[PDB]
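Researcher: I need the complex structure. Ligand is HZU. Inputs:
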Amino acid sequence: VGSLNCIVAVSQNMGIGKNGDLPWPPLRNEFRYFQRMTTTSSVEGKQNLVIMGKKTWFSIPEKNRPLKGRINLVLSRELKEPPQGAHFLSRSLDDALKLTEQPELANKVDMVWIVGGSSVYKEAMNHPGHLKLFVTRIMQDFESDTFFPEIDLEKYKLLPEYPGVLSDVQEEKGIKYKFEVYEKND
Ligand SMILES: NC(=O)c1ccc[n+]([C@@H]2O[C@H](COP(=O)([O-])OP(=O)(O)OC[C@H]3O[C@@H](n4cnc5c(N)ncnc54)[C@H](OP(=O)(O)O)[C@@H]3O)[C@@H](O)[C@H]2O)c1
Ligand SMILES: CCc1nc(N)nc(N)c1OCCCOc1ccccc1C[C@@H](CF)C(=O)O
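Model: Output:
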């Protein structure tokens, strides 16, 4: 089981969601970036694992659940079984990560990607050990009802570049944004 990663897109006012959807209009290449980063496995024969909260799961259109080419795991304390289309369900991020050591997953999983929402990011960013945060900074304010927790700059370093990730300003639909990568290893 490989690295532990968070990936998020966040507006200038720290918003990540609004009424069960994204706060901004669809950004095709931000979506393509999300898909490629979470799907690409460095190891032949393995897939990455995506971990998400219950509301993030149901925010994906039904025709696109589960996220293709990745092993999907949902966090919830209320659901008694994985929702339809999913095969894994844990009560906490800690439980989910311990689950990746069991035989059914240990040999199938390469990278682990936390893909939201807010309380999943929060549990991960406080998780001890080696963590990377792939953060898209959308350079506008958008009305939001769900937010990304602030990064503790006493623990994380901002990398100037990351392999395979463009470091310059992007723009689609009139909206500028930038791909950032933070790292810690405590
Ligand atoms: N911009 C982005 O990068 C991005 C990413 C993801 C989602 N989104 C947006 O954000 C919204 C969804 O995120 P959200 O924060 O509202 O909800 P969420 O985190 O996806 O779902 C919340 C629920 O998931 C479970 N949960 C979450 N964190 C948990 C944890 N650490 N341990 C155990 N269970 C946990 C709980 O379910 P139970 O009550 O059943 O226990 C909780 O009520 C949508 O608007 C979506 O479009 C945006
Ligand atoms: C692209 C946003 C994003 N960007 C970064 N960088 N990190 C993230 N975690 C992230 O959320 C991914 C959440 C999964 O959403 C989907 C995956 C497949 C099909 C459709 C959706 C839902 C629509 C709108 F709800 C969407 O979200 O594109």
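Model: Summary of the prediction. Residues 1-186 form one domain.
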